[PDB]
Write a protein that binds this ligand. Structure first.
Ligand SMILES: Cc1ccncc1NC(=O)[C@H](C)OC(F)F
Ligand SMILES: Cc1ccncc1NC(=O)[C@H](C)OC(F)F
Lengths: 304, 304
């Protein structure tokens, strides 16, 4: 019993964190096999960030200009290349702690853990979600760039995010491990506004199922709804439209609790229309959307 | 920018998790140097838990009855002893992954990270607090016993909690690493009620300072209060009394923000009396109390 915002155990990712320095800029890198991945803005000064031409800036850099340190020992850089917004620094030594891994590009609404790092050293781990506007709501200070987001399936780490920037609104943007930004963001010190941060409806429903499994049941009502009726309400409250694909993904939770997905939609419809009336669900006074249906099943079953 | 419920990187603790089996019961153990620490109720059957005489049950167990497995390899048990509610299983091999460590008994209101484990394998990491009633609000299923709570200072892991039980109300109780339960709880399958779960006032104030640092400032008002006036309000709302010791601990946050501790107390007094009026602070619709002043400083400065 109990339900917490849980992150994946970070050990396999901690063993990959290194410090990358180029000139006067230091950030984090991810060392997998004989390659170190890091944000390409490591080659920029604060002045360069205003309007950088990364291809031109890179011409002035050689392998010996990228200082890579794993703990207290120096890695020898034998090659460098730019792939989209990430630099790939080939080193002469394979990381002995390289876990089984994959690079995945996640979709909005999916969750992952972040190992926040500074100077190649891990500071903490937290769980977050790729928002529908392609930003993440993290906790990152200057020096955290190159910190990564990931999911774990048994012994395989799927890296999905690398931190690159903070928007002027305090929200965060980054890339997948191929260097492609999520959303329309660019690695430039220019104000870039984020779109509507809508609520991840399928995740709220998954979290309501988690609440019922854990005994918080006050919000269950005598009503049902349809996908089209529910979606009129979701539109009004800046919630993502629920589809039959989302209903299908909620199937195991509906089966375990015996609460039909459309009945849980009607409970959510009432919570949106009436509010919580000073009450809480799983220790929260708002509707939580950073648990996927898979996260709920995993936590509720104890998958290791 | 941004402020998250962050757990310590769990790698150093993952390297200590092992599986302990005695008879038909399996739970987690903590392997440090040549000792494996685990809850003494590993020697009980479900029937024994009703009224166990641990000293008598232990007489029927020998070193070879405690099966300890670290990953896929078996540890040889060369001694066993009971210290309060924990068993200490001496093994013939020192854990090569033993980090620098200490055993600490924490006070109510202090936070720590939990590495939830099943069958010796880590499932996830989350942050929580020792409540004023000596329970923790965790996420633990059957098989999670022996999972530990800890804090990290640079390279030293301070273990403070070992999970032993779930109360009939869905809250959790456990011991320090000396086997002494926090609070009045016992390792018996008897209903034991928890006391008033009061709010950790110093932690709420610390979190309001974190909110101001991150730009959420709507709750700042034109008022001040006194410790005695604030405490009358804290009493009414089941908040812990604020002392001059708590004010002193909030000093660095008061210094950084320029907001006097008693002025922040007056903001909190108004939030208690008026509610949030449908607004949020750091993504929360309630007053968060599971960040200590030390946690706020650490996260706001990027300590690794
Ligand atoms: C300051 C800071 C704080 C937290 N997270 C990231 C950054 N860093 C940036 O925004 C970098 C400078 O720009 C990126 F787009 F290239
Ligand atoms: C069931 C369960 C689920 C989650 N956490 C712990 C337990 N386990 C217990 O309560 C054990 C049986 O009693 C302890 F007091 F000795």
């Amino acid at each position: 019993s109990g339900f917490r915002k849980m992150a994946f155990p970070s050990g396999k990712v901690e063993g990959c964190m290194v410090q990358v320095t180029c000139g006067t800029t230091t950030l984090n890198g991810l060392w997998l096999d004989d390659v170190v991945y890091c944000p390409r803005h490591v080659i920029c000064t604060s002045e360069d960030m205003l309007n950088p031409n990364y291809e031109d800036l890179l011409i002035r850099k050689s392998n010996h200009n990228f200082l890579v340190q794993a703990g207290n020992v120096q890695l020898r850089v034998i090659g460098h290349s730019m792939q989209n917004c990430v630099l790939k620094l080939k080193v002469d030594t394979a990381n002995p702690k390289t876990p089984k891994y994959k690079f995945v590009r996640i979709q909005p609404g999916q969750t992952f853990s972040v190992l926040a790092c500074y100077n190649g050293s891990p500071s903490g781990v937290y769980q977050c979600a790729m928002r529908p506007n392609f930003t993440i709501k993290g906790s990152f200070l200057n020096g955290s760039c190159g910190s990564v987001g990931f999911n774990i399936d048994y012994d395989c780490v799927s890296f999905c995010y690398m931190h690159h920037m903070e928007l002027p609104t305090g929200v965060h943007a980054g890339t997948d491990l191929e260097g492609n930004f999520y959303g329309p963001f660019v690695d430039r010190q220019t104000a870039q506004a984020a779109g509507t941060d809508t609520t991840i409806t399928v995740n709220v429903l998954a979290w309501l199922y988690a609440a019922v499994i854990n005994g918080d049941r006050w919000f269950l009502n005598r009503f049902t709804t349809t996908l089209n009726d529910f979606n009129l309400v979701a539109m009004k409250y800046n919630y993502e439209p629920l589809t039959q694909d989302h209903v299908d993904i909620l199937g195991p939770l509906s089966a375990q609790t015996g609460i039909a997905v459309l009945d849980m939609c009607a409970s959510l419809k009432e919570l949106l229309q009436n509010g919580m009336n000073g009450r809480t669900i799983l220790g929260s006074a708002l509707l939580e959307d950073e648990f996927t249906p898979f996260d709920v099943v995993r936590q509720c079953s104890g998958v290791t």
